[PDB]
């Protein structure tokens, strides 16, 4: 297992514009297009991202290239952030995947509210961090996704994905 396989399991693959769990226009492997309610705005964002007139549909190769860009952007965002980088650098490779997964789903700003969880993770207090992570809108709105990610932080294994 690696971060790409983990997120492909969590996000799935759709080659036509769809709505995510919050109602936002998305395509591919969880690529957010826009938070605007306008399908035309989403189609414009898609064409800009791909570099051609897509009319709302992409190929598998295009979806995989967008996904690579999105994972890279999540990693770069962690490494540029003075609050996230020290925690990330303290984690082993499996738990680092759980960190990227959260940033991919919620962004740097979504993970801003997890300050207490981040401190517990840096201190390697895995069970306490797991309970604190679950006391969140994230866990209550996407509980199965959250349970898999939290289990990865708690155990440092891929068991939730096997
Ligand atoms: Cl879920």
Residues 6+ apart with CB under 8 A from 36: 25, 42
Q: Has 38 been labeled as part of a binding site?
A: no
Handedness of CA 151, 83, 76, 137 (dihedral sign): positive
Give catalytic residues, as residue numbers. Answer: 11, 20
Report the Cα 68 to chain-centroid distance in Å.
Answer: 12
The long-range contacts involving 103-112, CB below 8 angstroms and separated by at least 24 positions, are 103/74, 103/77, 103/78, 104/7, 104/30, 104/70, 104/71, 104/74, 105/10, 105/30, 105/138, 105/142, 105/145, 106/138, 107/77, 108/77, 108/78, 108/81, 108/84, 110/138, 111/84, 112/83
The DSSP call for residue 58 is -
Measure 149 CA to ligand 1 centroid, in angstroms: 11
How many angstroms separate the CA atoms of 91 and 138, rounded?
22
How many angstroms separate the CA atoms of 138 and 76, rounded?
22
CA–CA–CA angle 86, 99, 20 (5° rounding):
140
Of 63, 146, 67, whose CA–CA distance to 102 is shortest?
A: 146
Helix/strand/coil for 162: coil
Residues 6+ apart with CB under 8 A from 75: 100
Measure 142 CA to ligand 1 centroid, in angstroms: 4
Q: Has 39 been labeled as part of a binding site?
A: no
Measure 137 CA to ligand 1 centroid, in angstroms: 12
Q: Has 132 been labeled as part of a binding site?
A: yes
How many angstroms separate the CA atoms of 76 and 56, rounded?
28
What HEC string does 78-128 produce?
Answer: HHHCCCCHHHHHHCCHHHHHHHHHHHHHHHHHHHHHHHHHHHHHHCCCHHH
Measure 53 CA to ligand 1 centroid, in angstroms: 33
DSSP 12-55: --EEEEEE-TTS-EEEETTEEEESSS-HHHHHHHHHHHHTS--T
Q: Has 117 been labeled as part of a binding site?
A: yes
Strand 31-34 to strand 14-19: parallel, antiparallel, or no bridges (unpaired)? unpaired
Is CATH 1.10.530.40 the right assignment for the domain spanning 6-162?
yes
How many angstroms separate the CA atoms of 118 and 124, rounded?
10
Q: How was this structure determined?
A: X-ray
The ranges assigned to domains in the chain are 6-162
């Amino acid at each position: 297992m690696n971060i790409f396989e983990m997120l492909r399991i969590d996000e799935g693959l759709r080659l036509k514009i769809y709505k995510d769990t919050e109602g936002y226009y998305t395509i591919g492997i969880g690529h957010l297009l826009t938070k605007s309610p306008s399908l035309n705005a989403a189609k414009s964002e898609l064409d800009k991202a791909i570099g051609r007139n897509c009319n709302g549909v992409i190929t598998k190769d295009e979806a995989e290239k967008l996904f690579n860009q999105d994972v890279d952007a999540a990693v770069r965002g962690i490494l540029r952030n003075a609050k996230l980088k020290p925690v990330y650098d303290s984690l082993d490779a499996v738990r680092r995947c759980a960190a990227i997964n959260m940033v991919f789903q919620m962004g740097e700003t979504g993970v801003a509210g997890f300050t207490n969880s981040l401190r517990m993770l840096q201190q390697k207090r895995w069970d306490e961090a797991a309970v604190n992570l679950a006391k969140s809108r994230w866990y209550n709105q996407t509980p199965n996704r959250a349970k898999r990610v939290i289990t990865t932080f708690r155990t440092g294994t891929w068991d939730a994905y096997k």
